[PDB]
């Protein structure tokens, strides 16, 4: 898996000092970057069907978080659908 | 956090020096890319369940070496099936 070093080093970075980890930014940040790494075992050994559940489960988490933050500010969704690598 | 306690079985009908050749390689195959080589004991020169080319057993040891890159014991494992002198390759992870 992403060795817990990977989790904790990436997770401290993708949220500004709004005084802790766990924003609508960095939560999905770790989630999707982990997607992107695990997509290789969904591509290299592209016989992987069941982390196609841990994947799309947190995709649905990411999606219900993503589909409504236009009203938090202009800059969260504007700059952050730029500041996340994921579609739309 | 992934110990490659690379233990193995050597040939049976041979001498001590053949044991030593094998055991210094199988301590050494890992040094390259992270050694942490602790001790080297020489376990049972014993048999097993059934026959292995008219014989049934071989020589043993104890090899404490770890590699977090996971590619030093692959060497120990891929270059084993082929040659009937390295008859088994079973390592652990002391995780």
């Amino acid at each position: 898996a992403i060795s817990q070093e990977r989790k904790n080093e990436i997770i401290k970075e993708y949220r500004v000092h709004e005084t802790d980890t766990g924003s609508p930014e960095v939560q999905i940040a770790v989630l999707t970057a982990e997607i992107n790494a695990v997509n290789e075992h969904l591509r290299t050994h592209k016989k992987d069907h069941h982390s196609r559940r841990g994947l799309l489960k947190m995709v649905g988490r990411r999606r219900h978080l993503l589909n409504y933050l236009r009203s938090k500010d202009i800059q969260r969704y504007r700059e952050l659908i730029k500041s996340l690598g994921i579609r739309r | 956090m992934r110990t490659y306690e690379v233990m193995y079985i050597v040939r049976p009908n041979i001498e001590e020096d053949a044991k030593k050749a094998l055991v210094e390689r199988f301590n050494g195959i890992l040094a390259t890319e992270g050694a942490e080589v602790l001790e080297a004991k020489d376990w049972g020169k014993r048999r097993l369940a059934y026959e292995i080319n008219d014989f049934k057993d071989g020589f043993y040891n104890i090899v404490r070496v770890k590699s977090d890159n996971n590619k030093a014991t692959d060497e120990f494992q891929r270059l084993a099936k082929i040659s009937d002198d390295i008859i088994r390759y079973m390592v652990i992870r002391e995780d």
Partner: protein, 56 residues
Amino acid sequence: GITHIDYKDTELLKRFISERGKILPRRVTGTSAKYQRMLTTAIKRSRHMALLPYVK
């Protein structure tokens, strides 16, 4: 109860072992399920090398 036992050991798995080279069922034994699971597992890391027979 015991501490760990791993594929260093193959006859500390003789307490719960048969005469053919296998182990007795856990239901007939009945101890620390977790500790006995890994302890018995290592003997199967040893049926790899097969120091204990299958039949004579």
